[PDB]
Amino acid sequence: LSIPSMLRQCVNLHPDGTAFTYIDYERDSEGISESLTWSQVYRRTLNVAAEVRRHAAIGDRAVILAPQGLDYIVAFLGALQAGLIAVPLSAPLGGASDERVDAVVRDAKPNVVLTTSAIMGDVVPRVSPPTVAVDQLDLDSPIDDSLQTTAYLQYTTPAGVMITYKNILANFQQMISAYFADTGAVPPLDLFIMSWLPFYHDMGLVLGVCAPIIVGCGAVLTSPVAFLQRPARWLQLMAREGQAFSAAPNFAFELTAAKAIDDDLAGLDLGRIKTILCGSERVHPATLKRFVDRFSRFNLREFAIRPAYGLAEATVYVATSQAGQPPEIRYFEPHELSAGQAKPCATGAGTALVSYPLPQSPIVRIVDPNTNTECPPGTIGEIWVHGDNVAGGYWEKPDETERTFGGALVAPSAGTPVGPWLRTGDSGFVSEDKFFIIGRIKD
DSSP states (O other), X not given: OOHHHHHHHHHHHOTTSEEEEEEEXXXXXXXXXEEEEHHHHXXXXXXXXXXXXXXXXXXXXEEEEOOSSHHHHHHHHHHHHXXXXXXXXXXXXXXXXXXHHHHXXXXXXXXXXXXXXXXXXXXXXXXXXXXXXXXXXXXXXXXXXXXXXXXXEEOOOOOOEEEEHHHHHHHHHHHHHHHTGGGTTOOOXXXXXXXXXXXXXXXXXXXXXXXXXXXXXXXXXXXXHHHHHOTHHHHHHHTSSSEEEEEEOHHHHXXXXXXXXXXXXXXXXXXXXXXXEEESSOOOHHHHHHHHHHHGGGTOOGGGEEEEEOOGGGSSOSEEOOTTSOOOEEEEOHHHHHTTBOOBOOTTSSEEEEOEEOOSSSEEEEEETTTTEEOOTTBOEEEEEESTTSOOOBTTOHHHHHHHHOBOXXXXXXXXXXXXXXXXXXXXXXXXXXXXXXXXXXX
């Protein structure tokens, strides 16, 4: 039913199984691991929940301003355990990033701020609500109020996407069914999650923090700076024992192919990697090819690479490639694409695009954004999305909610709901029964 309840079940079933392992490379370029079992992380979460209840009531917002690490995870889970609506943000980094933080805090109006003692002095100016240094609590002392609906707000004029447990669970059902379709929607026994994505991004939170609990497997986590410093670390950590499930944007596939150092890869066997999602940015076929052409020499399988389309307003996932096959690439004439039409062209020529199966859940339609009517196959329009993973709106923003989540189709085709539809702002088309993403409709 909810993340707190599923964490409790993880403890009941496998209290001594390793849940989260965080690798810090600041003090040793080989990495220092710190791990928690399910029982350890649950205890820490209960201790955070007890603290936050002293400051905030059920349904209040709890902003999280903490560096990447285990304290972030227990702050987020502890907020949920106490029935608070968590608001995951980044540590204060300066510049625009700090004015984003200030604007989110004024929008979400939190009654508690969860942080760490190391950055406490940087956090206090950014927030009167009590500020709790999570690492200074007695997190491992021996020791519910959760909601069943709204879990957290995902910001990314600040508009906080309201994400419910129903949204999360529906999106995980959709993801597990699509990613693992070739094994009957059953993940392998030795799956593990590996992520360096920041927890204040949708994919980093959903994969790094939520998925271990919902799927019931351990996670191996590090920070984005550790990856950027030495990109081979991503491959080293995915090559740990078991079948890794990871994710990154297109730029990081390119950077790893271009900058991972061969000697850091010596002896790695990438042939057990289950899935590497490529998502949150337009997926470039040329980048996927450079990545697989290099890392197939270490046994990476091309069917492990899964382009993934989505957005925070849909929790995270909308569509992905067919399980058990490498990405399908199709080619289209560029002059016609600029004119709004998809015209196939010879393999390799024109514009290469990833071809996605139309998802069975959620559903996708290509819609003319000025007439609210579905486009014929081949005509470019806005991608509209419908399904139980689609959020119910932006926090305390009725008007922006109507504009973004209130799409309504004129004369919908058979089997297509009138609405409400999430208007993604993304442009795309359907061609030969496959789905394609081009860009943004504003363009």
